[PDB]
């Protein structure tokens, strides 16, 4: 594989460079590969990295280019005027803009393969898109190609889509190179910011909902949603994966599955991004989603998660049943047996399944992972697989029958639950899950967790876990170091998806920062360790779309400008989930916050959705975030889009 042309350190501010002499008559087949290492000096406007065109008047629509948008989209066009053929292939959120005050160096590539009739695009080690098109065009197919340009496209004798930046290195090949060669050629520093990668140990092509936490030992812990049937919240097959770093985030463990069902296996699916397929979903699969981490005072770690039985969306879960039944003062999980209409059974002591009608134990029992036994032996069901030719079918593998499955003999109430697991070794191993009792009441479903961390209120030792119902905040708490759980339900002014996080301002004084349906971040204050809550106030410097986004806010252990500090991450834009910012807030003696500093994470039109902050052992700050707009139907089912970055406080002061 030898380049037909190579150029280096080409600095441009809109005007481009003519390379026609060097490239006219190099592309005999018509196929091509172009690999471009670049950085942008200005991201505004549509910019072409190179352009091969018919430059004569009348032939404005006869060209091939690779382009970048101010939102980080990478794409290509291949067009021919006289035949009115117009190919466009792209993927949102493909490149980085700026990082810590400097333009980021990216490496992207295009492959045009006339035998396969495909265009492929690569960015920073990932094949971001591959598309077979019917009206395929290569360089020879376009009539009268006479101009070859770096950093623009010559249309009707004028430069269009002028690039602003430096082409550090650009290589043209007169053939289609193979996938692994180009992935490798595009690998760079950007590629190293992934902790979870598509089709890693987890078997998932997709991830959403990152969480970071630092343990007392100096381990930095991460969890994430491993979402297997694309990035849909529901319906989907979702596991919680984890990974950790014992060296201040420089290196991470291979990801482990920590909360998982096996009614479907953990295997990679190629989820359609086209408008006609992207609404496809994995239907019948039990799920964990939305993790919350806290470390207790005794150094045991807790992790909570939402639990969804197979076929239960957030929208279709019954809201008028907890899934639990009260018998002689105790709460017990109800079960319906196949062929019954009513819920005649309960799980009591030792997981023994009781017939409530007779008040006698049956021969069935439920294990600590919700698996169903009969006379002490496991019942089985066939595992499902997914295939695209979409079809879901039984694959011949037997797994334990489970109360959360579609094919179970005994089934839970089709509603959402909360489960928690604990670790005595800083997240190397975990207990079996405990389903949370019906803290909201017997005739109400469980709340939904606000992903991220919980806190320990220093003065009382109260454990606080943020959650919400749709209409209320539900602050789940324990006053006996996690042996028992209660909830403070707080009515909100409207139907907020009130994903929240807590900070402590001073002893006894806490604030819950949350998403709303009004465009603002709300904060509620408690001066009695969470027992009662003030009316909401709103941050005046963040302005988001009405749907909102999850946020992250943490306490920071070191003084900044002599003051106690908190650190907030959120998008900040009414155009979408964009324009990520980190804000440093300094607490005053009266417990108001001086929001003194902010730092923009990349350019304002680049994507920034859910995020998580942690303080590193060395007092740097770790950030992981969805670097795309996770609301947009245009940015679903994207691979390798949740990076991790470390900041110094001095970095966060700038902007």
Ligand X SMILES: CC(=O)N[C@H]1[C@H]([C@H](O)[C@H](O)CO)O[C@@](O)(C(=O)O)C[C@@H]1O
User: Rule CB under 6 A: which residues touch ligand X?
Assistant: 46, 61, 67, 75, 77
Among residues 31, 263, 499, 629, which one is catalytic? 499
CA torsion 395-401-406-409 (nearest 10°) is 130
Minimum distance between the CB of residue 53 and ligand X, rounded to whole angstroms? 12
Closest CA to 152 of 48, 256, 1, 12: 48
Q: Which residue has the tokens 């998008």?
A: 571
Under DSSP, is residue 230 helix (H, G, I), strand (E, B) or coil? coil
Cβ 151 to ligand X, closest distance in Å? 15
Strands 472-478 and 463-468: antiparallel
Q: What is the CA radius of gyration of the chain?
A: 27
Q: Smallest distance, Å, CB 77 to ligand X?
A: 5
SS3 447: coil
Is 610 an annotated catalytic residue?
A: yes
Please, is 342 exposed, middle or buried when counting C-beta atoms within 10 Å of its C-beta (0-12, 13-18, 19+)?
exposed
Dist CA 626 CA 569 (whole Å): 12
Between 63 and 477, CB nearer to ligand X: 63
DSSP reduced 3-state for 536:
coil
- Is residue 279 part of the annotated active site? The answer reads no
Q: Write b or e for each residue in 227-249: b if 16 or more Cβ atoms lie within 10 A of its Cβ, otherwise e.
A: bbbbbbbbbbbbbbbbbbbeebb
Task: Quote the least distance from Cβ 140 to ligand X, whole Å.
Answer: 21
What are the beta bridge partners of residue 113? 118
CB atoms within 10 A of CB 611: 28
In the chain, count H helices and then E strands: 3, 51
In this structure, are residues 641 and 580 in contact, taking their beta carbons and an 8 Å threshold?
no
How many other CB atoms are there within 10 angstroms of residue 250's CB atom? 10
DSSP string of 139-206, one letter each residue: TTTSTT--EEEESSEEETTEEES--EEEEEEEEEESS---HHHHHHHH--TTGGGBSS-TTSTT--SE
Closest residue by Cα to residue 72 from 52, 53, 99: 99
Closer residue to ligand X (CB): 149 or 198 = 149
Produce one character per residue of 618-639: b if its CB has 16 or more CB atoms within 10 Å, e if not: eebbbbbbbbbbbbeebbbbbb
The position carrying tokens 């089985």 is: 380
| Closer to ligand X by Cβ: residue 109 or 403 | 109
Residue 133 or 645 having the CB closest to ligand X = 133
Tell me which residue has tokens 């039944």: 325
67 or 513, CB closer to ligand X? 67
602, 610, 626, 635: which one is catalytic?
Answer: 610
Element housing 295 (H / E): strand 287-295
What is d(CA 357, CA 519) in angstroms, rounded to the nearest whole number?
51
Rounded CA separation 466/475 (Å): 5
Of the residues 233, 290, 295, 629, which is catalytic?
Answer: 233
Residues after which the chain has a gap (C–N > 2.5 Å): 389
Strands 452-453 and 287-295: parallel
- Smallest separation, CB 7 to ligand X (Å): 23
> CA 111 to CA 463: how far, in whole Å?
54
Question: Is 69 or 462 the residue whose CB approaches ligand X more closely?
Answer: 69
393 has catalytic annotation: no
Count the residues in the chain.
Answer: 655
Structure tokens at 274: 């086209």
Name the residue nearer to ligand X (CB basis): 46 or 257: 46
Angle, CA 267 vertex, CA 266 and CA 273 arms, to 5°: 120
Closest to ligand X by CB, 119 vs 583, is: 119
The position carrying tokens 């509603």 is 415
Distance CA 647, CA 628 (A): 20
Catalytic residue list: 233, 499, 610
């Amino acid at each position: 594989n030898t380049p037909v042309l190579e150029k280096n350190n080409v600095t441009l501010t809109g005007g481009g460079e003519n390379v026609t002499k060097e490239l006219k008559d190099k592309f005999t087949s018509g196929d091509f590969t172009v690999v471009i290492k670049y950085n942008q000096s200005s991201e505004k406007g549509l910019q072409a990295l190179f352009g091969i065109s018919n430059s004569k008047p009348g032939q404005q629509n006869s060209y091939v280019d690779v382009f970048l948008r101010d939102n980080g989209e990478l794409g290509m066009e291949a067009r021919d005027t006289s035949s009115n053929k117009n190919n466009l292939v792209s993927r949102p959120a493909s490149v980085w803009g700026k990082y810590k005050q400097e333009a980021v160096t990216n490496t992207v590539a295009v492959v045009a393969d006339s035998v396969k009739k495909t265009y492929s695009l690569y960015a920073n080690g990932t094949k971001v898109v591959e598309k077979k098109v019917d009206n395929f065009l290569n360089i020879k197919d376009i009539k009268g190609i006479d101009y070859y340009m770096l950093g623009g496209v010559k249309r009707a004798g004028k430069t269009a889509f002028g690039f602003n930046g430096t082409l550090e290195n650009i290589k043209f090949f007169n053939s289609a190179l193979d996938e692994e060669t180009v992935k490798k050629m595009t690998t760079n520093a950007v590629t190293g910011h992934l902790i979870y990668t598509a089709n890693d140990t987890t078997g998932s092509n997709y991830f959403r909902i990152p969480v970071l936490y630092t343990f007392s030992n100096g381990r930095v812990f991460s969890s994430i949603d491993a979402r297997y049937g694309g990035t849909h919240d529901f319906l989907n097959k979702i596991n919680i994966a984890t990974s950790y770093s014992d060296d201040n985030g420089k290196t991470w463990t291979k990801p482990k599955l920590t909360l998982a069902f096996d009614d479907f296996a953990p295997v990679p699916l190629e989820w359609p991004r086209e408008v006609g397929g992207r609404d496809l979903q994995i239907s019948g699969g039990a799920t964990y989603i939305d993790s919350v981490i806290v470390e207790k005072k005794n150094k045991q770690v807790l992790m909570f998660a939402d639990v969804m039985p197979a076929g239960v969306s957030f929208r279709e879960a019954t809201r008028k049943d907890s899934g639990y039944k009260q018998i002689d003062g105790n709460y017990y999980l109800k079960l319906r047996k196949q062929g019954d209409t009513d819920y005649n059974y309960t799980i009591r002591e030792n997981g023994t399944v009781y017939d409530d009608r007779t008040n006698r134990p049956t021969e069935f029992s439920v294990d600590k992972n919700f698996g169903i036994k009969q006379n002490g032996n496991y019942l089985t069901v066939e595992q499902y697989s997914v295939s695209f030719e979409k079809t879901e079918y039984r694959n011949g593998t037997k797994v334990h029958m489970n109360i959360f499955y579609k094919d179970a003999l005994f089934k839970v109430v089709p509603t959402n639950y909360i489960a928690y697991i604990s670790s005595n070794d800083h997240g190397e191993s975990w207990s079996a899950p405990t389903l949370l009792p019906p803290i909201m009441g017997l005739n109400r479903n469980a709340p939904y967790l606000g992903p991220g961390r919980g806190i320990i209120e220093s003065s009382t030792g109260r454990i606080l876990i943020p959650s919400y119902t749709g209409k209320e905040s539900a602050f789940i708490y324990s006053d006996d170091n996690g042996a028992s759980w209660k909830v403070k339900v707080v009515p909100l002014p409207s139907s907020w998806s009130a994903e929240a996080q807590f900070v402590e301002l001073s002893p006894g004084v806490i604030q819950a920062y949350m998403r709303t349906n009004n465009g603002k971040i709300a904060y509620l204050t408690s001066k009695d360790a969470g027992t009662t809550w003030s009316a909401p106030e709103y941050l005046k410097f963040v302005s988001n779309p009405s749907y909102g986004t999850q946020l992250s806010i943490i306490n920071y252990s070191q003084l900044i400008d002599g003051k106690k500090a908190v650190i907030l991450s959120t998008p900040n834009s009414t155009n979408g989930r964009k324009h990520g910012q980190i804000w440093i807030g300094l607490i005053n003696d009266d417990n108001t916050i001086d929001w003194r500093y902010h730092h923009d994470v990349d350019y304002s039109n680049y994507g920034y959705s859910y995020s998580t902050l942690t303080e590193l052992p060395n007092h740097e700050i770790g950030l992981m975030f969805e670097k795309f707009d996770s609301w947009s139907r245009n940015e679903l089912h994207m691979k390798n889009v949740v990076p991790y970055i470390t900041f110094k406080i001095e970095d966060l002061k700038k902007n």
